[PDB]
Amino acid sequence: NINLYKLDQRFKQSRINIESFHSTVLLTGQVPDPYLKQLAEDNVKAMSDVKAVHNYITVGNKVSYNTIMQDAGVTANTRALLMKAPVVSDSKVLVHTEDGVLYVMGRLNTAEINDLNNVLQNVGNVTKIVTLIDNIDLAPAPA
Amino acid sequence: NINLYKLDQRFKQSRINIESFHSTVLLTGQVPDPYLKQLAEDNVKAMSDVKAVHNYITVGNKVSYNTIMQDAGVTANTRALLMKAPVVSDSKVLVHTEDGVLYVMGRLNTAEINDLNNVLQNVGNVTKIVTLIDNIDLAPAPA
Ligand SMILES: [Zn+2]
Ligand SMILES: [Zn+2]
Ligand SMILES: [Zn+2]
Ligand SMILES: [Zn+2]
Ligand SMILES: [Zn+2]
Ligand SMILES: [Zn+2]
Ligand SMILES: [Zn+2]
Ligand SMILES: [Zn+2]
């Protein structure tokens, strides 16, 4: 029961964001040990109707208030660029920024993905971009 | 500068979720004092491209780990019911559950809103539902 021991004290030191879009979950945030990072993934994967989980939680101290506000501003800037985009729609992707990493998740076609990649290069205050896009034009695997 | 004093210590005691959909922001979570709750709203409202902010942060202790996992499961259950719904689409609303309160936000027409209300009555483990829906069929105000 090591991953449950003193869970309350460890979670008080944590920030855990759980964001779902369709049946895919993005985990971001900060926890004090790898046991809690894995527990969060295990617990989310066990939820009904969850298909895939992307666990980008880090093991380390919680980020500062100014960081989450800067992160939110990056996300707001990205959403504004998306609703202005020619092809890709703002409704079709989830956008989250955690500690300067811009995450974009959703289901798009190839034309929409190319537009999205063009938009994301225009976002400031981003150290890394992680796209989690399922291309709906990909042929399904054979039986 | 009372709302900034010892901000780092106060934010360590906090959970602040900032979720945007189109140009509307939902704030949920827990902070130790009303000054931080108001500061979060002021800082989010100041971001470029933010039109409306719904501040549902509470002043109190951070919720437990088991609570955020139960909350996520409510959200996952709601998303599953939405993608099965006849009229309303899962892509058109943002769903978030915080401490047993189900928040649904987005832009819908009347038919989609009626379907949504039918779906939300079928979600368990919810003490309160807060819909933040803009009905796109509402006539715009006169000049
Ligand atoms: Zn879906
Ligand atoms: Zn894994
Ligand atoms: Zn992944
Ligand atoms: Zn987010
Ligand atoms: Zn929009
Ligand atoms: Zn206010
Ligand atoms: Zn409101
Ligand atoms: Zn949420």
Domain boundaries, chain A: 2-59, 65-135
**CA A36, CA A59: separation in Å to the nearest integer?**
9
Length in residues, chain A: 143
Structure letter (DSSP) for residue B6: T
For chain B, give the longest Cα–Cα distance: 52
Extended strands (E) in B43-111: 52-55, 58-59, 93-98, 101-108
What is the distance in A from the centroid of ligand 8 to the CA of A4?
24
Q: Which residues face B54 on adjacent strands? A: B26
Residue type, position B116, single letter? L
Which of B11, B68, B92 lies at the smallest CB-CB distance from A91?
B92
Residue B5 burial by CB count (10 A; 0-12/13-18/19+): exposed, middle or buried?
A: exposed
What is the distance in A from the centroid of ligand 1 to the CA of B68?
22
Query: CA A85 from chain center: how many Å?
Result: 21
Q: Is B134 annotated as a binding residue?
A: no
> How many C-beta neighbours within 10 Å does residue B32 have?
17
Q: Is B54 annotated as a binding residue?
A: yes
| Cβ <8 Å between B50 and A16 | no
Q: Which ligand is nearest to the CA of A37?
A: 2
Which experimental method was this entry solved with? X-ray
A52-55 and A24-31 beta bridge pairing:
parallel
Q: Which residues of A touch B47 (CB under 8 A)?
A: 72-73, 76
Resolution (A): 1.6
Q: Which ligand is nearest to the CA of A56?
A: 3
**CA B122, CA A109: separation in Å to the nearest integer?**
33
Task: Evaluate whether B96 touches B27 at the Cβ level (below 8 Å).
Answer: no
Closest CA to A103 of A45, A18, A23: A18
Q: Is A54 annotated as a binding residue?
A: yes
What is the distance in A from the centroid of ligand 8 to the CA of B11?
19
At residue B92's C-alpha, the angle toward residues B87 and B97, to 5°, is 105
Task: Evaluate whether B108 touches B136 at the Cβ level (below 8 Å).
Answer: yes
What is the distance in A from the centroid of ligand 8 to the CA of B12?
20
Q: For ligand 3, an ion, list residues with CB under 5 A.
A: A 54
- Strand, helix or coil for residue A48: coil
Does domain B65-135 fall under CATH 3.30.365.10? My reply is no
Tell me the helix, strand and coil percentages in chain A, rounded to 5.
Answer: 40, 30, 30
Which of A20, A64, A75 lies at the smallest CB-CB distance from B75?
A20
Q: Is B19 annotated as a binding residue?
A: yes
Query: Is B4 in CB contact (< 8 Å) with chain A?
Result: no
Tell me the helix, strand and coil percentages in chain B, rounded to 5.
Answer: 40, 30, 30
Tokens 């500062």 belong to: A64
